[PDB]
């Protein structure tokens, strides 16, 4: 076990969905999985294992911020042998190319964190997902009739930003939304030779100021 | 209200104890507070309001890491008018001068985060607590008989460090332990003109190599909890 | 009629193949492009327009290094109205998952350059290609039987590196090879709302030191050239 | 015997007051010490030993700027076995919470220097004083009826700043004044396991534009001096 | 022999004139050299050897940008035994001290590149030419009657800058013009213990927006070419 | 008139010799200057005005480190209208090209300071002297038979370095010795459009550990002193 997860070794399936909110994790388990079982609950951060169309899938909460997400993903990969990690979170849109409830696939995750400079020789790590997973998401979305928005996200250490004047420039450079974990998810899976992908649903639009079941079904179907 | 707290304005007393683990927040509520009332629970991050020896105090969980801690502390100060914030967390020791279950008062919080450079002109912000709260901690601990170790902590973005070779250097510069929130709590309270202090109890020793169970991280630290409650009385 | 291109507006088709070496650009025009016409030649950096399976395609040399690549790509987009930019080049392998003659599709381009920090608020810009273009490359490679390797590249300001001790760490973080332009092409295309993708053929293995002979170098690369022309038509 | 101090080993008491200005060091020796003795004079940077109310105490100049301070402090600790170093300097106020001639105790020293990143892994070192000395100063100030302001200072490489637009942000983050050595004093004493503290009296008010004269910066701060001598007794 | 130069070892003279544009290299070979042989042409990047008024000298193109220039200079020094490198080229004026057609000798080259921090301990490398070459340029221009402006240049990674708002500041600090290679040339010559100098001629004024005609760009730089060739004699 | 200089306006000649040690400044006034007159003494930092071979010449102490040197140089130029600043001093050699008693002319000054990044858009400022002054020194040294060594120096914030393992790399990049002010003097003179040059005499070798005796130090420094005074005539 670990300081942060109290599941037995082997309780996690090799494919795992991730959200920051452990209550969204619990919602998915109850609504979409058969024979769901809570397997961890340290710090109220819940994880579950269960079945979707007969196939095992795990769920795990990772909290908020790159440092929190990195703890849980590192342990899922190294201790619990998880191979495929699909984050399904929320984000604040900053681009006119997306609207409320749109699903974004993050093909790159920029950041204001120092974590990847520490990891990567003080240079610029382009934090990216596994390509096969990104291709799988695109094809799965197509057969579900979901319109996938695709681009970069900006993973910030700040929910309440001190650089809101720079949102336009981020959007100019194909950043569709801001969240707070993807660059850490991506860098950790790169570090540990695992397959990761971030999808986020737009819950706020930061420019225009304006029930993610479709993203959940997308994630479950691409793990089938 | 706020995106991460569903208490209404006025639910928090202006003095608030803080832990990363909302279950520790839950444990302190049930055991030490009379008429404890759960006042927030978004994302399972629990907060409480209750009285301690007749004086009202609040409790709030802040999650793990500077980014998580900053969200909750910002919201407590700006929206819930919390005035004094006392973090009582855990940490990993990197100094021979401390052992398991020792209490550390962080008079400075160094960091490998970029957050304070972003806040502070790309310069070095020396993240520090409110001196009056630190003096209270020292005096209260003296009165209670608690041996308070005082020094810097290092607030890291990494629980699993890529720089374990640097631990002796950190300890040479008076860093007693590593945790992951103090520099953010301190900078946020500095930004927002509030009073903050970080106390942390040693749950791991990174040199003599020990570690405490997740249960033990809630249960073996009543000394630090009582010290915090007494400071706020 | 930019400082570095003397074509007229309208001489470039909206899809353009890019190489650092203008002589390779010339090779492609003479071997593959019907009705190939030279349209620019400032600094001996040649560009061409022609047709491949009935579709208009342009070709342009960009020289070596992010700064050189950035000049040409900026001018192609902002003056000559190029919308899709497909770069093919060579690279030096640093990963045990790729070998000589492999074709790599760069789904991200890390860098030791300061250019993207200058462009992007002194933060970390994750320099990435257009997804629909990468989709086309994968689908076309499968169709042509090419076993496309997919991962990051590291775009360096140094051909002769001062950090060869870091190659294993780059390879651990899914960098398959080093070249010197992709981070620049990707960031310029992101800035200017254009669709770009980089493919590179492994001519040299920086770890084992194996290297293609000149005849091998042109034996392969022809496949990469066909891939690029096929995905653009 | 160092390049910068020509005292003999054993001339310094373990407790030493420090000023940047050696003529203030001279002023203190002549006015407040019995049996005072000039023990060093290299580069006109004077130091003295003598008694204050029967008790031995040393005084030493450290010049202006972190690099100068670090030289003298390093030598006082490593060569002359000084254990307690109390700086009593001057500063320029940037916060409305203080005025001319107020005394400030620096519970942290932010900086625009690169020295602490060089010392400390290119991370953020929170340069802080020894807590027991800081406790000593608060208690003695109270005991003497001296009003003592407490907060951070910002130690800059610049007397003539290029970032005066940033002073309000500094003041917002609890920086009461700007001086040029405390960060280096603090980090050197952390490096070398010594006890250090910085007090500074406001000699310039950067928001209203007052500036005392050179004569005045030596003679107008007797309360800070008496405070320092008292906490060393 | 080298990946980017296909001359035989010994084909270059120890003194080599450098220019970014290989067609300008060819122009110099035609108008100023006798018995000139083109000795290298990889990537259309021409180099020559021949006689300037009876004295053997070489010419070599280096492309655009620090990374491109560093490749060619490194190969000239380490493989082809070049000892004195004189670089000429154009620049964009940012100071009121220079105007169109002025020749600038760069006694320092500042930069927005990360390359010298990678080279030099992440500190500030002051990239400078060989002094004897600068003195020889100064005496040769005086003798030839050529007015030589002397100061710093700024070597940018960006031909199309994102920091045009900063040009006045660069000019205040004695940056007369912007180009894209000198900082790399100087750092490379310093690494490899070779002598190097950069002259540049103002073809464009980035402030007043004046520019030379197409004819003038062909014909106005002969005085700089002659100065270079003469100081190699 | 300034917080650090109590000279009357007009007390300084427009040509000023600088040295960090005010007692060395006094020594120069006392031995070489006709009608030498003390004009400032704030903080025991002496300065003088007088005549050498009939021409008026000022001397000024600037203390140790970039921050201190910047204070005095800024005030000399801005308040006292000093136009030409000739800095002498000592240095610690790190290159095998120089030995004890050698006089070094610094045509560039690298640094580990953050000052020039703060000054210069967070980019790399190449700190360089005025070229005319460098020629004057070379020509005067020639006339006087002095074998003047020319290259870069490294201006460090640290007398007691934490990076001694890097000295060989510094010397590789043509850094002949280490001192602590030149990068600041140069940047300040660039900022304020003044003419400055740094000369330093090798008193110690940090590689071979040779050192000049306390006596033989003063006879080696008269040569550099006379070089400086002869340049200002
Ligand atoms: N402006 C923003 N708007 C909506 N959601 C987010 C988020 C995401 O939601 C969480 C913050 O509520 C956090 O984990 C992050 O992934 N970050 N920033 C946001
Ligand atoms: N060796 C250790 N290293 C880093 N952080 C912690 C902590 C603290 O406990 C949590 C991480 O387990 C988080 O709240 C952090 O601040 N305890 N032990 C730690
Ligand atoms: N070790 C290496 N091996 C093969 N090719 C390259 C390249 C590519 O080839 C060019 C340098 O020869 C340049 O344009 C870059 O894209 N960089 N580094 C390389
Ligand atoms: N407005 C001001 N700004 C910066 N430093 C100082 C100082 C201090 O006084 C000296 C500079 O005058 C030096 O010791 C510095 O720490 N006094 N007033 C200052
Ligand atoms: N604004 C500018 N104006 C004129 N020349 C240049 C240059 C020089 O000309 C080349 C770009 O055209 C480049 O390699 C450099 O040598 N850079 N920036 C310039
Ligand atoms: N290793 C070293 N050796 C000799 N001199 C110096 C110096 C020079 O001498 C002073 C240090 O005593 C300082 O101000 C600088 O000018 N810095 N570092 C030195």
Q: What is the 3-state secondary structure (H, E, C) of D79-134?
A: CCCCCEEEEEEEEEECCCCCCCCCEEEEEEEEECCCHHHHHCCCCECCCCCCHHHH
Query: Can you tell me which atom of ligand 6 is nearest the CA of F92?
Result: 3
Q: Considering only CB atoms, which residues of chain C are within 8 Å of chain A? A: 105, 107-113, 116-117, 119-121, 123-128, 131-132, 134-135, 138, 150-152, 163, 166, 169-170, 172-174, 183, 187, 190-191, 193
Residues of B acting as catalytic residues: 204
Closest CA to B173 of D132, D191, D122: D191
Q: How many CB atoms lie within 10 A of CB C161?
A: 17
DSSP letters spanning F151-201: EEEEE-S-SS-S-GGGHHHHHHTTEEEEESSHHHHHHHHHHTT-EEEEEEE
Identify which ligand lies nearest to the alpha carbon of E205. Answer: 5
DSSP letters spanning B96-138: TT--TT-EEEEEEEEES-SHHHHHTTTSB------HHHHHHHH
Could you give the CA distance from residue D13 to residue C162 in angstroms, rounded to a whole number?
A: 50
Distance C184 CA to ligand 3 centre (A): 14
In whole angstroms, how large is the CA radius of gyration of chain C?
17
Measured in angstroms, the resolution is 1.7
Q: Which of E11, E130, E204, E222 is flagged as catalytic? A: E204
Spatial neighbors of D126 by CB under 8 A, at least 6 apart, are B108, B109, B110, B111, B125, B126, B127, B128, B152, B183, D108
Asked if residue B3 lies in contact with residue A92, where contact means CB atoms within 8 angstroms, the answer is: no
Query: Can you tell me which atom of ligand 5 is nearest the CA of E200?
Result: 16
Q: Do chains A and C touch (3 or more CB pairs under 8 A)?
A: yes
Q: Is E204 designated active site?
A: yes
CA distance A25 to chain C (A): 28
Asked if residue D188 lies in contact with residue F148, where contact means CB atoms within 8 angstroms, the answer is: no
Q: Across the interface, which of E45, E63, E66 has its CB nearest the CB of C157?
A: E66
Q: Is D55 annotated as a binding residue?
A: no
DSSP A94: -
E159 in contact with ligand 5, CB cutoff 6 A: yes
Q: How many CB atoms lie within 10 A of CB A160?
A: 13
Query: Can you tell me which atom of ligand 1 is nearest the CA of B4?
Result: 12
Identify which ligand lies nearest to the alpha carbon of D69. Answer: 4
Rounded to the nearest 5°, which phi and psi values hold at F175?
Answer: -90, 110
Structure token pair of residue B47? 């907060």
* Residue F150 structural domain: 1-233
SS3 state at D176: strand
Asked if residue D104 lies in contact with residue D202, where contact means CB atoms within 8 angstroms, the answer is: yes
Chains that touch A (3 or more CB pairs under 8 A): B, C
Distance B15 CA to ligand 1 centre (A): 27
Could you give the CA distance from residue A49 to residue A44 in angstroms, rounded to a whole number?
A: 16
Could you give the CA distance from residue F142 to residue F81 in angstroms, rounded to a whole number?
A: 30
Kindly give the pairing relationship between strand F47-52 and strand B55-61: unpaired
Q: Across the interface, which of E43, E67, E119 has its CB nearest the CB of C67?
A: E67
Q: Is B216 annotated as a binding residue?
A: no
Q: Do D67 and F180 touch (CB under 8 A)?
A: yes
Residues of D whose CB is below 8 A from B113: 124
Asked if residue B106 lies in contact with residue B134, where contact means CB atoms within 8 angstroms, the answer is: no
Question: Can you list the pairs that B205-213 forms with residues at least 24 positions away whose Cβ atoms lie under 8 Å?
Answer: B205/B92, B205/B93, B205/B98, B205/B99, B205/B100, B206/B92, B206/B93, B206/B94, B206/B164, B206/B167, B206/B178, B207/B93, B207/B94, B207/B95, B207/B96, B207/B167, B208/B99, B210/B100, B211/A3, B212/B90, B212/B100
Structure token pair of residue B82? 């919390």
Question: Can you list the pairs that B205-208 forms with residues at least 24 positions away whose Cβ atoms lie under 8 Å?
Answer: B205/B92, B205/B93, B205/B98, B205/B99, B205/B100, B206/B92, B206/B93, B206/B94, B206/B164, B206/B167, B206/B178, B207/B93, B207/B94, B207/B95, B207/B96, B207/B167, B208/B99
Distance A93 CA to ligand 4 centre (A): 47
Residues of E whose CB is below 8 A from F152: 126, 128, 190
In this structure, which residue's CA is closest to atom 14 in ligand 6? F64
SS3 state at A172: helix
Q: Which of F21, F112, F157, F204 is flagged as catalytic? A: F204
Tally of domains within chain B = 1
Q: Is D87 annotated as a binding residue?
A: yes
Closest CA to B111 of B168, B187, B202, B211: B187
Q: A60 pairs with which residues across the strands?
A: A18, A47
Q: Give the C-alpha distances (Å, rounded to integers) separating A137 from A131, A188, A216.
A: 10, 20, 12
Would you put residue F52 in left (φ > 0), alpha (ψ -120 to 50) or beta?
A: beta
- The experimental technique used to determine this model is X-ray
Residues of A whose CB is below 8 A from B20: 43
Which CATH number does the domain housing residue F223 bear?
3.40.50.1580
Q: How far apart are the first and last CA of chain B?
A: 28
Q: How many CB atoms lie within 10 A of CB D6?
A: 14
SS3 state at A67: helix
Residues of B whose CB is below 8 A from A44: 21-23, 44-46
- Torsion sign, CA atoms E217, E220, E223, E226: positive
Structure token pair of residue F206? 């940090």
B105 HSE (CA, 13 A, CB side):
27
In this structure, which residue's CA is closest to atom 9 in ligand 2? B90
Q: State the greatest distance between any 2 C-alpha atoms of chain C, in Å, as a whole number.
A: 48
Chains that touch D (3 or more CB pairs under 8 A): B, F
D195: closest chain B residue by CA: B174
Could you give the CA distance from residue C74 to residue C18 in angstroms, rounded to a whole number?
A: 13
E16 in contact with ligand 5, CB cutoff 6 A: no
Could you give the CA distance from residue C85 to residue C19 in angstroms, rounded to a whole number?
A: 10
In the structure, how many helices (H) and strands (E) does chain A have?
Answer: 7, 9
Could you give the CA distance from residue F213 to residue B179 in angstroms, rounded to a whole number?
A: 51
Closest CA to B159 of E42, F89, A69, F228: A69
Interface probe, candidates E106, E126, E132, E134, chain F, greatest F C-beta count within 10 A: E126
Chains that touch F (3 or more CB pairs under 8 A): D, E
E203 in contact with ligand 5, CB cutoff 6 A: yes
Q: F150 pairs with which residues across the strands?
A: F105
Distance F181 CA to ligand 6 centre (A): 9
Could you give the CA distance from residue F66 to residue D158 in angstroms, rounded to a whole number?
A: 9
Q: Across the interface, which of F3, F65, F113 has its CB nearest the CB of D68?
A: F65
Q: Across the interface, which of D23, D156, D162 has its CB nearest the CB of F43?
A: D23
A161 in contact with ligand 1, CB cutoff 6 A: no
Q: How long a stretch of residues is chain D?
A: 233
Q: State the greatest distance between any 2 C-alpha atoms of chain A, in Å, as a whole number.
A: 49
Q: Do F63 and D66 touch (CB under 8 A)?
A: no
Closest CA to E116 of A112, C69, C173, F117: F117
B164: closest chain D residue by CA: D121
Helix (H) or strand (E) holding C186: helix C182-191
Q: Do B214 and A4 touch (CB under 8 A)?
A: yes
């Amino acid at each position: 076990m670990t300081p942060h997860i109290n599941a037995k070794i082997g309780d996690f399936y090799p494919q795992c969905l991730l959200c920051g909110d452990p209550l969204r994790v619990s919602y998915i388990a109850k609504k979409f999985l058969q024979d769901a079982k809570e397997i961890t609950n340290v710090r109220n951060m819940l994880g579950f294992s269960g079945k979707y169309k007969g196939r095992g899938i795990s769920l795990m909460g990772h909290g908020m911020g790159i440092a929190s997400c990195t703890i849980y993903v590192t342990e899922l990969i190294k201790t619990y042998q998880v191979k495929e990690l699909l984050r399904i979170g929320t984000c604040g849109a900053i681009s006119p190319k997306v609207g409320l409830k749109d699903i974004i696939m993050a093909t790159g995750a920029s950041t204001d964190s120092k974590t990847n400079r520490v990891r990567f020789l003080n240079h610029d790590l382009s934090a990216t997902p596994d390509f096969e997973l990104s291709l799988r998401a695109y094809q799965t979305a197509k057969r579900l009739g979901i319109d996938l928005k695709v681009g970069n996200v900006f993973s910030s250490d700040f929910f309440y930003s001190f650089e809101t004047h720079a949102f336009d420039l981020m959007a100019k450079y194909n950043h569709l939304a801001i969240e707070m974990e993807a660059a850490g998810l991506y860098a950790t899976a790169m570090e540990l030779n695992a397959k990761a992908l971030c999808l986020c649903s737009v819950s706020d639009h930061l420019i225009t100021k304006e029930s993610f079941d479709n993203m959940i079904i997308l994630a479950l179907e691409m793990m089938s």
